[PDB]
Amino acid sequence: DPLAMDPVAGSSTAVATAGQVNPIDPWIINNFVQAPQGEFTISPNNTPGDVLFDLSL
Amino acid sequence: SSVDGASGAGQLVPEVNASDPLAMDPVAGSSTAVATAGQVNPIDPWIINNFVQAPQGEFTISPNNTPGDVLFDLSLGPHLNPFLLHLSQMYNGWVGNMRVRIMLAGNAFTAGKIIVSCIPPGFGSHNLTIAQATLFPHVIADVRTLDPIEVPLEDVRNVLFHNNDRNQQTMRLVCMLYTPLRTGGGTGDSFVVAGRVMTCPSPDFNFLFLVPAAAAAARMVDLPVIQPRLCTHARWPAPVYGLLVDPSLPSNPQWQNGRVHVDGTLLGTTPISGSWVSCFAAEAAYEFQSGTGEVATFTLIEQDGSAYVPGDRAAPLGYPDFSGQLEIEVQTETTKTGDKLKVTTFEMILGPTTNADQAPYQGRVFASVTAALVDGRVRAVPRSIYGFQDTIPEYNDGLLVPLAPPIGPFLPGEVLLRFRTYMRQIDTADAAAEAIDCALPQEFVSWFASNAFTVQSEALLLRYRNTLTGQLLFECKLYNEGYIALSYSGSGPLTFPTDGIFEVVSWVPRLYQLASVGSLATGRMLK
Amino acid sequence: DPLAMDPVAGSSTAVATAGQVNPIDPWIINNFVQAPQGEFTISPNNTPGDVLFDLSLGPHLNPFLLHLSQMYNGWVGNMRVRIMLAGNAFTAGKIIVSCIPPGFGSHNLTIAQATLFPHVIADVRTLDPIEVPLEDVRNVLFHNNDRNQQTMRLVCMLYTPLRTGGGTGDSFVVAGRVMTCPSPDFNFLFLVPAAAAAARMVDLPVIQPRLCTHARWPAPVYGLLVDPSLPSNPQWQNGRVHVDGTLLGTTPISGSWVSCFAAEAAYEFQSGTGEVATFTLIEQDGSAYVPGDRAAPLGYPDFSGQLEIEVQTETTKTGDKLKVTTFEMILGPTTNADQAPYQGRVFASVTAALVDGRVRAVPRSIYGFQDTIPEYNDGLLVPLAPPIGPFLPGEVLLRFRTYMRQIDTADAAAEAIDCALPQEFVSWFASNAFTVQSEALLLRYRNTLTGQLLFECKLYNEGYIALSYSGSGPLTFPTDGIFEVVSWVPRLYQLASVGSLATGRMLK
Amino acid sequence: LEDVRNVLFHNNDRNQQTMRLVCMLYTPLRTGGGTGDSFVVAGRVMTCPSPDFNFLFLVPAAAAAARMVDLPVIQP
Amino acid sequence: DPLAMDPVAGSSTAVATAGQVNPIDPWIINNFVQAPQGEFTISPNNTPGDVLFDLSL
């Protein structure tokens, strides 16, 4: 099954009113990097409901 | 959204559940109500397809469970979906079908099957055996099945649509264990299968009338967890020492202190402070009717120093509500540091006798200097009693006076629960403890006057329990008019441990039958 | 006339940025319902300029919307307000309803300035309602569920003085009602399960001090005062509780326990002249006393001097024969020197200067009182509730006061004894076990009858009340006399102190 | 007054639960002036059926009452 | 303002179940007459919350 979300636009919105729209080095553009809080472990001791991780865009 | 481990689950468990269709025809949705409902209220399309965890969303299977055990019993309604439930509070009525999805996925090592059956409204409640469940349109599934089983909860209706009352009977989905659960492998008995139930409304489903969202009040009064032996007595200023019932005492006492209703209504001369109990304040002087100034004339004031006016109770607050001869100690009132103090002892007669002065109700009482010093404003506290009788004094010298009513009534076999303390009674060659009872400890008096709870029926069912040991000692009825009853047949004062917490209950009609417990003798056989 | 404003856009802004744009039931769209803040009153007591009501745009202005608010996390749109006045032909006056844009802040506006905003004026006599559109002036794309957001507001003020004529009954007030419904531009945003989430707080019982029970001597409370010349940080063991319900010291639940004890009593013979009762203390509910984490059995006296006690056979059942003897017991340290309530053993002497087995002792008078703690453990450290305090500079303890009979010896006279809360408040906090959220509560002491505010004060969470007072100088207060919470209140909250109740002032 | 129904229609039975109209005093009545407490606001309720209204089965049921017991208002 | 309700259907429901569907005189259809429970009174003796009348369809 899919994700219950409609895709959201990117820079499309900014163009019209931001002063500049600065691009990023393409090498970063799709290179998967580990996040700071990127580690967690699931032991048999955890109960359903325990939080493994939290993230903010 | 859903990602079953198919990819890595090997082929140890069945993906999809192979089962014969439901022996049941499809049911119509909103189409019915369209013509007679005042409105047909559409719901957010996003809710229409999201399978969300129902409020009754969890269940567990374990090897302790025996076939027949009900894992969950769902009754058709908005209360089966969290979003719908919230919208429910805003509408009056609904019609439509629900889509239910039960989730299982135990280890490849577990074996077992459950059965879900749809029960038509109008069948009623009956304990179904696993074999009975088969008689209803049903579905059976192996606990290992990866993909969630989907079962449509059809809205079988006799009428066009539903309203939000108790007169409604909807279709049910009962899920029971079909075969015992047994884990194989290195059986970790901590292993139980954790099930999940998710639902989403079928597009047929619709809410009906817009209504004032809300109307779910529930003001439930509670009691404080204070043991009786930690409490203050409400009719004599001492700790509570005893907790008992005693069918041979007067059954309907006319106590003026320690009276309050569950709703907070204080009665009689009942004071808020237990320091006021059985005490008075006055301006004191020595008139001369006989002319031998041994008699103090006390013009009563209220004990917080304010003026006493004859009103709608028998006397100033906390003034004694019993008879006999009271020894009082009378001291200059304390207003400020350095107020010089005189302290005299007197005997005052509380009862009717006899040609015959004394009318606390009018504001005037006489005591005599146990000649058998102090004046201006004084405070009198009780020192001992002589010839106690637990009947009310003559408050208004023969005339009718305002009185809280006798305590009662009680059902047949019900008797008053007594909180008890001891007065010093004197003699005259011998002081000995004398019992005096009241209907609630002063802390409960203050508690109810302060909470002003809303009362919803005629009495509250309480349990008296030892919270330490856990032991339930008894049950009892706290009538709204502020007295507690037990059912007891003995003759026969019966005494209870004072350590000793009360818990509400219920509401409880007034003809609620309590358990007598007590004969701890089951005297008979059988076999 | 129409408002001096251009139509404000609705959902069209937050389309490419919110995750969802959620529409509402069109039946709500134009049904005018009474807003939760739907009532106000105008009376001759009001003065032109008084703000009858201040509304701020948001779904919280409509009951239906409000109910939906618990389901979504954002919103955008304009509403519509309608106001009604139930006036007479005797009520002359005008009201101003002005729209204040976000960002303006808060200022005191004269009726004249109130006119400078898009507004609507109405005579209090009108039978018909007044309608004003509440536009969603935005600086941002949309709004989130946050009442810290600055949205457009509607302020209603009395434009001219209310002047009732005729047989002027000052009990006459004009009833006002506010109603709203969302303009079709209104849209909720993200669908969040957020359906339920509240909290709680602490309250105090509305009992006046002079109706209360004292917590350190068993008598009614008679006095309410502060007194900078008394010991500022007393080490009271009774009448101690925290706002959270934590009882301290020897503090009992029942005020009948206060300054009383129970024991098994006997007459040993160290001197050998059996005038000395030896009391092996038990708790007053008849249970065994064990030396523990407080100084003595519950309610045992927490002061010194020489206490006259009356000791009676314990009452267990009707017919228990009773003996009653009077003794003098010394509470203070002195001196070579026995007495350790903490260990469970104290001695009194038959004011020879009868009873045994199990007894109960209640206080009869005090001789040489000093309000310092007795020597509970004969020289050794003992568990103690801490001194009361601290207090900010200029803050002093609020005292509940009662009087002991002190004896003499040719003269009994009242002697003052103070405590930090009445026993009813002791019981109240132990029973409620409130959750505490900061360091103290701001309370007002008020006459609810007359309405008069007497003072403000700080109830520290550790269970004692402070006032700011500079005098030197016991200052006494009326005892009739209700306390109200407040706030929370940081510990450095500055209280108000006082002035010379004379107001008059001259133009000069 | 809408006919909110759970069933197809209604029978002559006043034990049936139909939609109701409750009138309440929303705010306290406050008479001013020379307050004559003998003053009451008279209220009247009037109705007529919406064109959706229809009676159902034609029954000769034309007459059917009963009686009861009363006591004379004579003081003891 | 209008009631927060959707129009409710009339006879259309009981057509295939009642033995007859009987119409009424259109002159009654819109003539406002005093209901048998047509009177009530409000006085200062009443307190907000008092039910002045309770009608059932």
mmCIF file of N, CA, C and O in Angstrom, chain B residues 181-216:
data_model
loop_
_atom_site.group_PDB
_atom_site.id
_atom_site.type_symbol
_atom_site.label_atom_id
_atom_site.label_comp_id
_atom_site.label_asym_id
_atom_site.label_seq_id
_atom_site.Cartn_x
_atom_site.Cartn_y
_atom_site.Cartn_z
ATOM 1 N N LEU B 181 -3.306 -21.859 21.411
ATOM 2 C CA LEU B 181 -2.076 -21.308 20.884
ATOM 3 C C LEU B 181 -0.933 -22.079 21.504
ATOM 4 O O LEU B 181 -0.867 -22.243 22.710
ATOM 5 N N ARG B 182 0.011 -22.493 20.662
ATOM 6 C CA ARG B 182 1.167 -23.239 21.120
ATOM 7 C C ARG B 182 2.370 -22.892 20.284
ATOM 8 O O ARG B 182 2.342 -23.004 19.067
ATOM 9 N N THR B 183 3.393 -22.392 20.955
ATOM 10 C CA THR B 183 4.623 -22.035 20.295
ATOM 11 C C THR B 183 5.488 -23.276 20.292
ATOM 12 O O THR B 183 5.529 -24.025 21.270
ATOM 13 N N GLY B 184 6.183 -23.483 19.193
ATOM 14 C CA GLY B 184 7.092 -24.597 19.084
ATOM 15 C C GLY B 184 8.461 -23.986 19.314
ATOM 16 O O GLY B 184 8.574 -22.897 19.895
ATOM 17 N N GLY B 185 9.492 -24.652 18.810
ATOM 18 C CA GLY B 185 10.843 -24.147 18.966
ATOM 19 C C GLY B 185 11.293 -24.048 20.414
ATOM 20 O O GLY B 185 10.850 -24.833 21.260
ATOM 21 N N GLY B 186 12.230 -23.140 20.678
ATOM 22 C CA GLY B 186 12.732 -22.927 22.030
ATOM 23 C C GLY B 186 11.786 -22.052 22.831
ATOM 24 O O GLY B 186 12.190 -21.026 23.370
ATOM 25 N N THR B 187 10.527 -22.470 22.876
ATOM 26 C CA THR B 187 9.441 -21.798 23.577
ATOM 27 C C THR B 187 9.778 -20.791 24.674
ATOM 28 O O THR B 187 10.133 -21.163 25.800
ATOM 29 N N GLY B 188 9.700 -19.513 24.326
ATOM 30 C CA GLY B 188 9.923 -18.476 25.309
ATOM 31 C C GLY B 188 8.494 -18.185 25.707
ATOM 32 O O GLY B 188 7.763 -17.606 24.911
ATOM 33 N N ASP B 189 8.070 -18.643 26.882
ATOM 34 C CA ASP B 189 6.689 -18.438 27.343
ATOM 35 C C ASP B 189 6.267 -16.974 27.455
ATOM 36 O O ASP B 189 5.090 -16.663 27.675
ATOM 37 N N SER B 190 7.251 -16.085 27.308
ATOM 38 C CA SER B 190 7.026 -14.645 27.319
ATOM 39 C C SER B 190 6.321 -14.348 25.986
ATOM 40 O O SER B 190 5.777 -13.267 25.784
ATOM 41 N N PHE B 191 6.380 -15.336 25.090
ATOM 42 C CA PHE B 191 5.765 -15.252 23.775
ATOM 43 C C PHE B 191 4.269 -15.388 23.813
ATOM 44 O O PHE B 191 3.713 -16.358 24.333
ATOM 45 N N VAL B 192 3.639 -14.333 23.322
ATOM 46 C CA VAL B 192 2.199 -14.254 23.177
ATOM 47 C C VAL B 192 2.102 -13.538 21.814
ATOM 48 O O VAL B 192 3.054 -12.864 21.367
ATOM 49 N N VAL B 193 1.014 -13.739 21.108
ATOM 50 C CA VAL B 193 0.874 -13.071 19.822
ATOM 51 C C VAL B 193 0.191 -11.746 20.071
ATOM 52 O O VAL B 193 -0.878 -11.729 20.683
ATOM 53 N N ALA B 194 0.777 -10.652 19.578
ATOM 54 C CA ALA B 194 0.205 -9.318 19.740
ATOM 55 C C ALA B 194 -0.607 -8.975 18.502
ATOM 56 O O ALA B 194 -0.066 -8.889 17.394
ATOM 57 N N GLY B 195 -1.921 -8.906 18.676
ATOM 58 C CA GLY B 195 -2.796 -8.590 17.568
ATOM 59 C C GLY B 195 -3.161 -7.129 17.531
ATOM 60 O O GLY B 195 -3.091 -6.425 18.542
ATOM 61 N N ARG B 196 -3.561 -6.678 16.355
ATOM 62 C CA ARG B 196 -3.949 -5.297 16.149
ATOM 63 C C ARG B 196 -5.209 -5.263 15.309
ATOM 64 O O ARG B 196 -5.379 -6.084 14.415
ATOM 65 N N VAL B 197 -6.098 -4.329 15.613
ATOM 66 C CA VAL B 197 -7.339 -4.194 14.871
ATOM 67 C C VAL B 197 -7.409 -2.786 14.315
ATOM 68 O O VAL B 197 -7.266 -1.809 15.050
ATOM 69 N N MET B 198 -7.611 -2.685 13.010
ATOM 70 C CA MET B 198 -7.675 -1.394 12.357
ATOM 71 C C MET B 198 -8.930 -1.306 11.545
ATOM 72 O O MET B 198 -9.394 -2.305 10.998
ATOM 73 N N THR B 199 -9.480 -0.105 11.464
ATOM 74 C CA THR B 199 -10.707 0.104 10.736
ATOM 75 C C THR B 199 -10.727 1.415 9.985
ATOM 76 O O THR B 199 -9.976 2.340 10.287
ATOM 77 N N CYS B 200 -11.615 1.477 9.003
ATOM 78 C CA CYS B 200 -11.830 2.659 8.197
ATOM 79 C C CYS B 200 -13.246 2.467 7.674
ATOM 80 O O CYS B 200 -13.693 1.337 7.471
ATOM 81 N N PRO B 201 -14.003 3.558 7.537
ATOM 82 C CA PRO B 201 -15.379 3.505 7.053
ATOM 83 C C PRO B 201 -15.502 3.226 5.571
ATOM 84 O O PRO B 201 -14.669 3.645 4.775
ATOM 85 N N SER B 202 -16.548 2.503 5.206
ATOM 86 C CA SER B 202 -16.810 2.208 3.812
ATOM 87 C C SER B 202 -17.426 3.506 3.306
ATOM 88 O O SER B 202 -18.062 4.227 4.071
ATOM 89 N N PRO B 203 -17.244 3.837 2.023
ATOM 90 C CA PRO B 203 -17.824 5.074 1.494
ATOM 91 C C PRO B 203 -19.349 5.191 1.622
ATOM 92 O O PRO B 203 -19.920 6.214 1.249
ATOM 93 N N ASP B 204 -20.002 4.141 2.118
ATOM 94 C CA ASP B 204 -21.455 4.150 2.320
ATOM 95 C C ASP B 204 -21.752 4.885 3.599
ATOM 96 O O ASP B 204 -22.833 5.431 3.781
ATOM 97 N N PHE B 205 -20.816 4.782 4.530
ATOM 98 C CA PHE B 205 -20.944 5.388 5.835
ATOM 99 C C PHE B 205 -21.085 6.891 5.791
ATOM 100 O O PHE B 205 -20.332 7.568 5.097
ATOM 101 N N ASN B 206 -22.029 7.400 6.576
ATOM 102 C CA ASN B 206 -22.291 8.828 6.678
ATOM 103 C C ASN B 206 -22.862 9.189 8.035
ATOM 104 O O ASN B 206 -23.511 8.372 8.688
ATOM 105 N N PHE B 207 -22.555 10.399 8.483
ATOM 106 C CA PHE B 207 -23.069 10.896 9.745
ATOM 107 C C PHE B 207 -24.348 11.593 9.379
ATOM 108 O O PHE B 207 -24.525 11.998 8.231
ATOM 109 N N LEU B 208 -25.235 11.782 10.343
ATOM 110 C CA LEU B 208 -26.490 12.393 9.991
ATOM 111 C C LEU B 208 -26.826 13.810 10.394
ATOM 112 O O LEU B 208 -26.753 14.708 9.560
ATOM 113 N N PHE B 209 -27.186 14.047 11.642
ATOM 114 C CA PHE B 209 -27.564 15.401 12.000
ATOM 115 C C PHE B 209 -26.528 16.181 12.778
ATOM 116 O O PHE B 209 -25.888 15.638 13.666
ATOM 117 N N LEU B 210 -26.343 17.447 12.424
ATOM 118 C CA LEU B 210 -25.399 18.304 13.126
ATOM 119 C C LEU B 210 -26.004 18.654 14.472
ATOM 120 O O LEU B 210 -27.142 19.117 14.545
ATOM 121 N N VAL B 211 -25.212 18.507 15.525
ATOM 122 C CA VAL B 211 -25.672 18.728 16.884
ATOM 123 C C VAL B 211 -24.563 19.323 17.760
ATOM 124 O O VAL B 211 -23.389 19.145 17.464
ATOM 125 N N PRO B 212 -24.951 20.020 18.823
ATOM 126 C CA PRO B 212 -23.983 20.637 19.735
ATOM 127 C C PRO B 212 -22.943 19.633 20.221
ATOM 128 O O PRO B 212 -23.235 18.820 21.099
ATOM 129 N N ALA B 213 -21.744 19.693 19.653
ATOM 130 C CA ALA B 213 -20.669 18.785 20.035
ATOM 131 C C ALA B 213 -20.407 18.840 21.536
ATOM 132 O O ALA B 213 -20.115 19.901 22.088
ATOM 133 N N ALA B 214 -20.516 17.690 22.193
ATOM 134 C CA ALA B 214 -20.292 17.604 23.631
ATOM 135 C C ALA B 214 -21.420 16.844 24.320
ATOM 136 O O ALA B 214 -22.118 16.047 23.694
ATOM 137 N N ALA B 215 -21.593 17.097 25.614
ATOM 138 C CA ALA B 215 -22.635 16.438 26.392
ATOM 139 C C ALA B 215 -22.172 15.074 26.890
ATOM 140 O O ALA B 215 -22.859 14.068 26.706
ATOM 141 N N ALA B 216 -21.003 15.045 27.521
ATOM 142 C CA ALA B 216 -20.446 13.805 28.046
ATOM 143 C C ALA B 216 -19.884 14.002 29.450
ATOM 144 O O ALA B 216 -18.832 13.462 29.790
#
